[PDB]
Design an enzyme around this catalytic site. Structure first.
Site, short mmCIF file in Angstrom:
data_model
loop_
_atom_site.label_atom_id
_atom_site.label_comp_id
_atom_site.label_asym_id
_atom_site.label_seq_id
_atom_site.Cartn_x
_atom_site.Cartn_y
_atom_site.Cartn_z
CG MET A 257 -29.05 -14.34 1.02
SD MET A 257 -30.28 -13.08 -0.08
CE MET A 257 -29.48 -11.95 -0.21
CG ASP B 294 -19.65 -20.76 22.23
OD1 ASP B 294 -20.19 -19.77 22.21
OD2 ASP B 294 -19.93 -21.71 22.94
CE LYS C 99 -25.05 -15.32 12.85
NZ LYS C 99 -23.86 -16.34 12.45
CB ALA D 132 -25.98 -7.59 12.96
N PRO D 133 -24.88 -4.63 11.54
CG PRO D 133 -23.25 -3.68 12.47
CD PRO D 133 -24.53 -4.01 12.80
N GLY D 134 -23.46 -4.99 8.23
CA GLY D 134 -23.12 -6.01 7.32
C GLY D 134 -23.94 -6.26 6.17
CB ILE D 135 -24.20 -8.58 3.42
CG1 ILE D 135 -22.82 -7.81 3.04
CG2 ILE D 135 -24.81 -8.74 2.25
CD1 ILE D 135 -22.98 -6.75 2.06
N1 LIG Z 1 -21.29 -12.39 14.74
C1 LIG Z 1 -21.67 -11.33 13.82
N2 LIG Z 1 -21.52 -10.19 13.88
C2 LIG Z 1 -21.75 -8.98 12.81
N3 LIG Z 1 -22.79 -9.57 11.98
C3 LIG Z 1 -23.27 -10.70 11.90
C4 LIG Z 1 -22.70 -11.68 12.76
N4 LIG Z 1 -23.42 -12.86 12.57
C5 LIG Z 1 -24.12 -12.90 11.52
N5 LIG Z 1 -24.22 -11.25 11.09
C6 LIG Z 1 -24.80 -11.12 9.85
O1 LIG Z 1 -25.47 -12.09 9.34
C7 LIG Z 1 -25.21 -12.70 8.29
C8 LIG Z 1 -24.67 -14.31 8.38
O2 LIG Z 1 -25.89 -15.16 8.05
P1 LIG Z 1 -26.37 -15.74 6.68
O3 LIG Z 1 -27.48 -14.80 6.47
O4 LIG Z 1 -27.05 -17.06 6.85
O5 LIG Z 1 -25.41 -16.11 5.44
P2 LIG Z 1 -25.13 -15.26 3.95
O6 LIG Z 1 -23.95 -14.70 4.51
O7 LIG Z 1 -25.27 -16.21 2.40
O8 LIG Z 1 -26.28 -14.18 3.64
C9 LIG Z 1 -23.92 -11.81 7.87
O9 LIG Z 1 -23.97 -11.13 6.60
C10 LIG Z 1 -23.91 -10.59 8.83
O10 LIG Z 1 -24.17 -9.32 8.11
#
Ligand SMILES: Nc1ncnc2c1ncn2[C@@H]1O[C@H](COP(=O)(O)OP(=O)(O)O)[C@@H](O)[C@H]1O
Ligand SMILES: Nc1ncnc2c1ncn2[C@@H]1O[C@H](COP(=O)(O)OP(=O)(O)O)[C@@H](O)[C@H]1O
Ligand SMILES: Nc1ncnc2c1ncn2[C@@H]1O[C@H](COP(=O)(O)O)[C@@H](O)[C@H]1O
Ligand SMILES: Nc1ncnc2c1ncn2[C@@H]1O[C@H](COP(=O)(O)O)[C@@H](O)[C@H]1O
Lengths: 561, 415, 415, 554
Positions: free
Chosen positions: A311, A361, A326, A305-308
């Protein structure tokens, strides 16, 4: 005997749903009594409701007994046709099978992943849900049958006042000429959430068919009034949002209610529509199916999934889907010190909490099945690398021991890179809004960084990594100490002992205000957040036991205007 | 795609067979840092850049390439990309690097950029040389009799955060373990009690100790000292002494002196003889005020290190200008050691002793021994002359106050 | 039977309600001590009585009793009755007593008299007070500032001495217990490693901090500081802070201050506000030099305590004359804190402050504040006069060398 | 039935045991003859381990055969004894088995041989038929050693002087010798034992041969003094290696020589320790029947490691390990036993009392003064069991009782004192050269034998001398140091500094001066290093069993 079994499940469902309904007829008193601890409280029970009966059944089956499977289904299979709520009857069946079989080996032949029956759409509904209302013979009168119409046992204040409000509202919306020619088809039953009891109905105009929603609120000191009238789908979609607790509305048979709805909620898919009414566990099935259609219908492969990157969690999505999965990682980042369960708890806690439509949710899944063909190399290496304990290898398919499926939203951090100008004031305002509600909701987010918040289609901002999630009632809010000495200003290391579970609400400034652009606004409108005094209050009310009003609409629309 | 541009001119430092090979046009990765970091860092580069040219007549020049972490990164790379993984690769690929300050969260569930950097590069030795400079205001009568360099291990000591809370089941579980199977009878007040664990590793101890000893030889120091509360705790601290000396005898061929533990190690390049010795921490603290001349280099457990290093500096008045670095099998990273002090961000007020001096560590560690020697000259002349930043000046009598930018000049004037 | 007379005129110190009731005519039990103790111990008697005679007008006098232990122990009771039982029983019933030093045992396996005494009677608090006596010679510029009293606890810390030698089989057993059953991931090197256990009680901790508060209360001190590393080992060391503050609120009615942890405790005796605050240790060592003014009474764990007490004393050049005592649930003993230093013994040349100084504590302890002060006046004045023993005179110029016995007089005359 | 199978099996078992005992001894001559003085020690080490094996062996046999009564075996076994040259051991072997079978329980006269239940010439007399000068030659030539002699006619000359000096010459011509066919080999010496017979009395004659390096073996001295002999057979010294095909006879023969020793006392010297234990027991048994007395903590200084009790008229003290130790002392319980075992194996140079282990000891409450009684309960509960009027102590040792050195010294004016110190100081040395370092040199842990000799006893802290580091306390760096109660330098476990010894040794004014006088060397690291210095270097220091003066080199 085999056919006996089907009776046992089938008996079972009837039993649960009956229980479901009695819980849900409870509300009105709960609303009137003004006890809102119960109201949230009651909400939780339903969740437990479906499971108990399923739980209860298997034990029933187990005592019984101590190849035919196709047979038992057919018998369950064969008892459906009459049964109006057949649909759930299957799920419940499905739900059972898996418990019996530990969520493995399910196949369409083996159980109901798809419905036996031909499509629901009726010749007719046994009892019509909503009552058409007509303007003539008065219209301003019309609102009269409506309110005097409804059940609640309480007095009303400035009744005319409310009444006037709407008429002004529609008039602006439609204009008298259009207005005279449109009418209402209000729900037989109000939908109840939280502090308010909602009234759902269509509004039908020469132009077309429009949502008209009034939510009824209890004034301080027990008087009754209507906060607003929402006549836009955009507003409606939101008030039926997926970031909010399930509505508690009494439905003798759900399937019809849904059909009626869509016109109200053109956007939402079937799986979703089910949730709002509150059949979560059923939703799973549909939602599961709905995905299944996607898989047939695309050539895309699973991707991170795009983003960061996360951890705590491993998460991924098909490119074009609306939901993300997840998976809790086998070994968490060193800096993080939590344990698997805790995470497990958090997610549950969220499912059983009012979400304020700030918390997405979630749906748990077990022993999920994926086709190796589907999984892209980049992702696969990642799964094996980090989730090896959880995943199981099965030829061309792999089984993911634990999972969550959630709405897919653009992550907040990303949105800020894209947006600008007015649009941004648009976002930051919201996030700031989000934390207050959540805080007020006695949930304190932990990371609070944008990487952990999401953006809706409507721009709404929602919270999603539930790492470092906690009630605000177990945290101590402190004020950073003024430095003792001129020298003190420069110490890398704070000179004062910090107990764990200590929060300094001026610390965020650095993480929040990093961008030059973002920073002033937060300061501009959102000063309170960093003032440890404020949070202290928020927790103060809560300890005091107050539940705070949440409006699933813009403040302006609030019918003050 | 990285936003960091390799300098066209420079060449990569490479490490083989332990001793790093540093070319005369190095590329030294750098990080500005948050807060006051903008202020200081530009200065040090000048000072350092000045020193090199002056010393080597311009034959050797450092190409500096910036890399980013933690505030800039959000600006450069992403909104929420604090610690781009490019960075960790980069420092490691290029052997030595320098870091401006970073924001350390105060308490809570928030990760720390410095540890992460230490942690994720597995920087196991942290070296904090201490020296007085002239005229720095001090609380002690004759500081100038203080040149020491202190080596600590971040890897292994009691600072490993292995402990269990009081009344936590495990804790009581733990107590039981020693108490019944193990048979410890020493514990008093076992109920309602909390436990912690401390370990000493031959690999860990040798690892550090090898580290200094090589250092001295590298820099012609006169002795190596092992500080431990050996007498009370034989096994963990004491084993520190036992192990360290042993290292000398086996690895560096030290010859005993009089059968008392102490030994003399010949220095191959120097031909001077370095002494190896040990002294108790309890005493040692007392000793440093009275006899600081005696001790040149120190190696000690993790704990003794904070207390001692932190402790020496006060005497030298050096906290403000404290210098530091953390070191590793494949990289060394040299940092300013002070808070960001946001308030004064960009104002130009603050004084960058620490960061320059850290540069000074860097260069020596690069073998560019001569250049660093100037910086010390510069710092020394500049402070004695009583031209300085606010922090000092407020203290001294008849100083001439200087902005941050200028002082860095001031150092140069005195170069 | 016992070969000690119980003085007729005297009366037994007695404790009821845990608050000492001390008669005017008290009997105090003392041990001359090995070696130089003969030189020193007699003087203290001279001074102490003097301070007592002048101060209270001669209304009160002390009935000394000499209990015996150590080499003299041999000369009287036995040939190997180094430590007869009666003595302990004497100290326990009598409740307060003072001793010269006893031979420290350098060898590893020998049984140490000094220890046994404290250990056997469970005197768990070791209280050392450090102060500067004018004209004294010290490293720090402005040591005038330091007045502190230090509370540390002998029991219950890493000073349990619970450890296992590396590759002890037993130890390896322990890792396995930890590494796998406990499953700690924090040990970088688990082989060829040795371990120790550090613990802290709720009980042990409050054992003393309860004490400090009473000392402070009794003697009009401004505040109490709890020193801990509760930033690296919170539960084990962090706990110390957590309980101490807690103790304050719970027993001593401590109202909050600004939500900062610290609380202000009213003093029942005077009504003034005793204050309780905490500061990290490693940093704290920095603070004493820099701001000796602000700290007063201190209560700390065994380890920080040696380091801290040992450290201040250097600062005020008092290692020679430090006074010490250890205290117990129902017994307290005040000790000369220095070596037997046998060679000079009988020459009457040594310096008698620490032992005498210990007397103050004793005298203070029993509520004869007034007298106890007298010694102080005398003792500082005598130095400022720069009339002193061999240890100082060499150090400080234009000074007059006094045989030890004499010094006591100087102490007295200045009184 | 089975029984005669059983009884024989044991009885057979014994025979083997003894023969091996004999063979192992036989070697003795060869070793002395040759130079395997290490081997000499070892064989002595093993011999201790012989008796136990077979016994160990038998029971297994028995078990395997192994798998009322009991008595039938005693009679059957018992019936065998008449017409057996040496039953007595044979009994002792029996008991050992029973005890071994039953973990030392239930002993009774009935069950086993607590009590007795029931040829050829050792030495040939000599007369001064001719001048002795001939007479001795007969004896010297007759020896079985196969090495050269010097002063043949020399030391032979020496014998006379000592020989003549004692008795008037008119006496010499009258008296004659009754030497024993077997030399008793011990340590680095081969000893020649004989009665000396004369008009006044029949008196001891021992001549202890020695091997000069690449030796013309020679005789260090001659001992005819009544006392002197006892020393040679003292408990402190190691068991003799003598070949005694019928032991019991020898014992009676010796008896004249060693009027003092109890029989069992005699039994060890020949080296039959296990039997001696048996005899050891009985002698104990008659005594308590003899008088009504309780048990009292041995007079002295109480022991953190051990618990000691006694009988006022007795010669032995029973030492039992406390469960819980003095806090200061850190050592494993097992460790102590090991120590104890070691001395039993290690040659004792006449400085260490030998010990006899015991198991499941029983006496009942009549004989225990309450004070001891509680103390045992208080300080050693685990190790005691209560039956009836009887109580059982699981593990204990028994050793000769002497007066603790600390006790002696306050009962001595100087001349005795001077002698007493001299001995002790030697005492240290001799063990010292024996590779033993005594943990607490303190007097409280050495004893004075009847002959006023000093022997080490509380073995709690014993350690080899090759396990320690001997050190010089460092010169003080600065004048501050002179007055410090804490070592400033790294001190290591097993680091020992001799110089610190003074404080305990020299406390008393009377005592201290001699020590400097006689033994400065005790307090020097160098000395110990030298002694340990060699002992790494092979060397074994010869220990004489007589006053140095007496030897002829004087
Ligand atoms: N609903 C979502 N849509 C897009 N990306 C998501 C979504 N949920 C989670 N992510 C990705 O997973 C991460 C969130 O979970 P987590 O790794 O526990 O926390 P942290 O943000 O400290 O690393 C986010 O950084 C995101 O990139
Ligand atoms: N052979 C003995 N004869 C007489 N008394 C002895 C003997 N052995 C031990 N004791 C007594 O026991 C006391 C100490 O026992 P011991 O075990 O020798 O010392 P520790 O227990 O200190 O190691 C001695 O002081 C003495 O009173
Ligand atoms: N691993 C799975 N794959 C597909 N559907 C599932 C899975 N687990 C549960 N379900 C469906 O979830 C709904 C309720 O099942 P349960 O999760 O047991 O409550 C039913 O439609 C099940 O078929
Ligand atoms: N606990 C005991 N009580 C009495 N005699 C014993 C005990 N243990 C051993 N003996 C005697 O000592 C001799 C040798 O036995 P052991 O040394 O056990 O082989 C035997 O004759 C036993 O009778």
């Amino acid at each position: 005997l085999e056919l006996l079994i089907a009776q046992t499940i089938l008996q079972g469902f009837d039993a649960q749903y009956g229980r479901f309904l009695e819980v849900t007829s409870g509300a009105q008193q709960r609303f009137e009594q003004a006890d809102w601890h119960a109201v949230q409280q009651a909400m939780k029970n339903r969740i437990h409701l479906y499971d108990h009966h399923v739980g209860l059944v298997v034990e029933q089956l187990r005592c019984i007994t101590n190849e035919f499977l196709l047979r038992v289904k057919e018998h369950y299979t064969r008892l459906l046709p009459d049964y109006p709520r057949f649909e759930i009857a299957e799920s419940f069946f499905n739900s059972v099978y898996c418990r019996l079989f530990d969520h493995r080996s399910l196949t369409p032949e083996r159980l109901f992943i798809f419905s036996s029956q031909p499509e629901r759409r009726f010749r007719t509904i046994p009892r019509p849900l909503a009552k058409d209302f007509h303007p003539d013979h008065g219209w301003e009168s019309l609102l009269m049958r409506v309110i005097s119409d409804l059940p609640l046992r309480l007095h009303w204040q400035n009744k005319s006042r409310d009444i006037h409000y709407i008429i002004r509202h529609l008039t602006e919306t439609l204009g008298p000429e259009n207005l005279s020619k449109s009418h209402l088809q209000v729900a037989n039953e109000l939908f109840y959430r939280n502090k308010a009891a909602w009234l759902v109905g269509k509004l039908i105009t020469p132009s077309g068919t429009l949502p008209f929603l009034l939510p009824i609120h209890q004034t301080d000191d027990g008087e009754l009034f209507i906060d607003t009238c929402l006549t836009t789908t955009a507003e409606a979609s939101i008030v039926f949002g997926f970031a909010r607790s399930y509505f508690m509305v009494y439905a003798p048979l759900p399937a019809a209610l849904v059909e009626w709805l869509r016109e109200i909620l053109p956007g939402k898919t079937t799986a979703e529509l089910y949730m709002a009414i509150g059949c979560q566990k059923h939703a799973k099935t549909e939602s599961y199916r709905e995905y299944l259609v996607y898989l047939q219908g695309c050539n895309e492969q699973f991707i991170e999934a795009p983003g960061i990157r996360g951890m705590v969690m491993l998460v991924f999505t098909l490119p074009g889907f609306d939901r993300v999965f997840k998976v809790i990682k086998d070994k968490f980042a060193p800096q993080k010190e939590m344990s698997a369960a805790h995470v497990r708890a958090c997610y549950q806690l969220v499912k059983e909490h009012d979400r304020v439509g700030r918390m997405a949710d979630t749906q748990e899944f077990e022993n999920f099945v994926l086709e190796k063909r589907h999984i892209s190399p980049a992702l696969m290496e990642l799964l094996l690398q980090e989730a090896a304990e959880k995943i199981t290898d099965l030829g061309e398919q792999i089984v993911i021991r634990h999972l969550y499926i959630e709405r897919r939203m653009v992550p907040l951090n990303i949105w800020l890179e894209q947006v600008e100008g007015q649009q941004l004031r648009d976002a930051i305002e919201e996030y700031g809004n989000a934390i207050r509600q959540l805080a007020a909701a006695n949930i304190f987010p932990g990371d609070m960084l944008f990487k952990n918040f999401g953006v809706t289609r409507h721009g709404r901002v929602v919270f999603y990594d539930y790492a470092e999630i906690c009630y605000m009632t177990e945290v101590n809010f402190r004020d950073i100490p003024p430095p003792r000495y001129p020298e003190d200003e420069l110490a890398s290391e704070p000179w004062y002992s910090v107990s764990p579970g200590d929060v300094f609400p001026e610390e965020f400034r650095h993480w929040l205000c990093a961008d030059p652009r973002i920073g002033p606004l937060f300061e501009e409108m959102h000063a309170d957040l960093f003032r440890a005094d404020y949070w202290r209050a928020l927790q103060n009310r809560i300890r005091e036991g107050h539940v705070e009003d949440v409006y699933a609409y813009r403040r302006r629309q609030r019918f003050s205007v | 795609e990285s936003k960091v541009v390799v300098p066209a001119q420079g060449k990569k430092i490479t490490l083989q067979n332990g001793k790093l090979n540093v070319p005369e046009n190095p590329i030294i990765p750098y990080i500005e840092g948050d807060g006051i970091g903008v202020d200081v860092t530009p200065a040090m580069l000048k000072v350092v850049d000045a020193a090199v040219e002056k010393a080597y007549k311009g034959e050797r020049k450092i190409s500096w390439m910036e890399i980013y972490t933690g505030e800039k990164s959000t600006q450069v790379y992403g909104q929420d990309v604090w610690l781009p993984a490019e960075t960790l690769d980069l420092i490691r690929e290029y052997r030595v690097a320098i870091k401006g300050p970073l924001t350390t969260p105060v308490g809570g569930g928030i990760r720390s950029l410095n540890v992460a950097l230490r942690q994720e590069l597995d920087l196991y030795i942290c070296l904090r040389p201490v020296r007085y400079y002239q005229g720095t205001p001090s609380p002690v009568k004759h500081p100038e009799l203080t040149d020491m360099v202190i080596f600590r291990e971040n890897s292994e000591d009691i600072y490993a955060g292995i402990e269990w809370k009081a009344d936590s089941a495990d804790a009581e579980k733990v107590i039981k373990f020693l108490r019944e199977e193990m048979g410890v009878k020493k514990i008093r007040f076992p109920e309602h009690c909390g436990i912690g664990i401390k370990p000493c590793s031959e690999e860990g101890t040798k690892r550090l100790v090898r580290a200094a000893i090589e250092y001295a030889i590298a820099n012609d120091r006169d002795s190596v000292t092992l500080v431990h509360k050996g007498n009370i705790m034989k096994f963990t601290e004491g084993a520190f002494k036992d192990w360290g000396y042993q290292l000398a005898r086996e690895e560096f061929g030290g010859e005993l002196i009089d059968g008392g533990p102490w030994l003399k190690v010949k220095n191959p390049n120097t031909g001077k003889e370095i002494v190896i010795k040990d002294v108790i921490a309890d005493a040692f603290l007392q000793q440093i005020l009275l006899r600081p001349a005696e001790y040149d280099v120190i190696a000690c457990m993790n704990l003794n290190g904070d207390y001692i290093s932190d402790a020496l500096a006060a005497q030298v008045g050096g906290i403000g200008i404290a210098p530091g670095a953390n070191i590793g099998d494949e990289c060394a990273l040299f940092e300013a050691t002070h808070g960001t002090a946001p308030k004064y961000a960009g104002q130009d007020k603050v004084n960058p002793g620490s960061i320059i001096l850290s540069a000074e560590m860097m260069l020596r560690h690069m073998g560019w021994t001569e250049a660093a020697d100037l910086i010390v000259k510069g710092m020394e002349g500049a402070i004695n002359a009583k031209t300085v930043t606010y922090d000092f000046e407020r203290l001294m009598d008849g100083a001439k106050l200087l902005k941050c930018s200028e002082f860095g000049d001031a150092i140069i004037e005195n170069m």
